[PDB]
Amino acid sequence: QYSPNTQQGRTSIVHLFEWRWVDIALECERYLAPKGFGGVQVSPPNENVAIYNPFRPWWERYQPVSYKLCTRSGNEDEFRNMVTRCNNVGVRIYVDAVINHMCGNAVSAGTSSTCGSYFNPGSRDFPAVPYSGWDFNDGKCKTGSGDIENYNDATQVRDCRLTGLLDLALEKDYVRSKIAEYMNHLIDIGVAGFRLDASKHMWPGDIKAILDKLHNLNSNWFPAGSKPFIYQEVIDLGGEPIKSSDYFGNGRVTEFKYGAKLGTVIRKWNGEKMSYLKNWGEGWGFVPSDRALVFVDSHDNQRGHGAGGASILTFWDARLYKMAVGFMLAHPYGFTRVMSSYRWPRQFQNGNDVNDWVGPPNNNGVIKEVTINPDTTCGNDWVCEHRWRQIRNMVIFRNVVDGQPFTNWYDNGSNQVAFGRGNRGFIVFNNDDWSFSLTLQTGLPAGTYCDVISGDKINGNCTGIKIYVSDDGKAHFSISNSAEDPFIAIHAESKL
Ligand SMILES: *[C@@H]1O[C@H](CO)[C@@H](O)[C@H](O)[C@H]1NC(C)=O
Ligand SMILES: [Ca+2]
Secondary structure, eight states: OOOOOOOTTOOEEEEETTOOHHHHHHHIIIIITTTTOOEEEEOOOSOBBOOTTTTSOGGGGGSBSOSOSOBTTBOHHHHHHHHHHHHHTTOEEEEEEOOSEEEETTSOSBSOBTTOOOBBTTTTBBTTTTBOGGGBSTTTOOSSSSBOOOTTOHHHHHHSBGGGEEEBOTTSHHHHHHHHHHHHHHHHHTOOEEEETTGGGSOHHHHHHHHTTOOOOOTTTSOTTOOOEEEEOOOOOSSOSOOGGGGTTTOEEEOHHHHHHHHHHHTTGGGOOGGGGGGOSGGGTOOOGGGEEEOSOOTTGGGTOSTTGGGOOOGGGHHHHHHHHHHHHHSOSSEEEEEEOBOOOOOEETTEETTTTOOSSEETTEEOOOOBOTTSOBOTTBOOGGGSHHHHHHHHHHHHTTTOOEEEEEEOSSSEEEEEETTTEEEEEEOSSSOEEEEEEOOOOSEEEEOTTTOOBOSSSBSSOEEEEOTTSEEEEEEOTTSSSOEEEEEGGGBO
């Protein structure tokens, strides 16, 4: 459950947040496969509550009504079509599995669901699954409100409602079986793994019981004995009775401290500087690298809805964001997830963004298709960070240096640092308020290399900066604190 199952040489997955199945299918063939992306995190593919107040928020998808593959992203056939086409081109699909709960207990009964299924939160009835009052933790939760009230009580965090969301009795074999039924349907269709939503709110043992019911991956695309990739969403920062290590026996876990600290370091909050990243990784109190799923920002915390708070870097902070993603993709720690978002009318009031609920680009609730502009960027308000030259090229950079050791580190005691990945890659950063001009040992073989941040190698020539490595592996780098992108990266495949 720890192996991504991506095909040899692809090292990252991209979260195509709220994309329609048809658009993801096209993206797999036209861009993801050609550019070497390993896989795609898709939004919950199961039927959710259609919320109109506010108008169709992104979070309505974390409010299950049934396990029918029927959402604003498309129907079951479109989903299967997407998984098949992506797999045929070597790009894996990872499903966002919302299995801890169903919808909010206050939601009105009726058929206000993405597929018309009837449901009645009040009486705990979800006939489309089916689930009844006997399948929820109402009688097990010991808080006065029935919701989670105190995170210092590990029991309540697991048995009570996360902000009103009906909590499934995951210790019952019936519920475990209905959930495994849903997940096995997806595995047999061809998905390679799952993001387990709200894992902190489930007992490690209950999750394990469900995983034991899972099939091996589809033998038409994967070698016999392949187990699905499992990454558990657990927000674990400082002191809490619950630790992300409690979930290691089930698969990897999301390391939220990663994006949080990279953000404060690059923003240089409270005296932090890049020279400190020298021992980045477990040295910073993070989980072991082989159990980590890392990222700079997620759909949750990019809008202030998750761990990290204000330090998190997103596409809104373009310049610093690219540099953070660059460091992540170059550093050997963890398995990397790249974010791909949509723009929304951010509107801060008293420090909080009042429009953090806004769902994906749409026309009367119908999600807009992703349009590709002539320069490869996206239209219809999709940001497509994964298509930014700077990000796409660092994705490739990680593929080229895969397996290579962390070496040749340099820092000026402040914010200009550099390091290499064996003899396959080298990257330099300048986050100080003054220029950087120095000769560094790169460990790379002599030659002329194209800087993949400022340009591309395009048939015997570079469209951007060029670096010359001498016989002893030394090379000169110049980055003024005024450069559009204050960092340079060169690798074995950008060599002329
Ligand atoms: C590189 O570009 C120059 C013009 O700037 C051209 O003379 C040269 O032939 C090009 N080399 C290749 C290999 O395309
Ligand atoms: Ca729970």
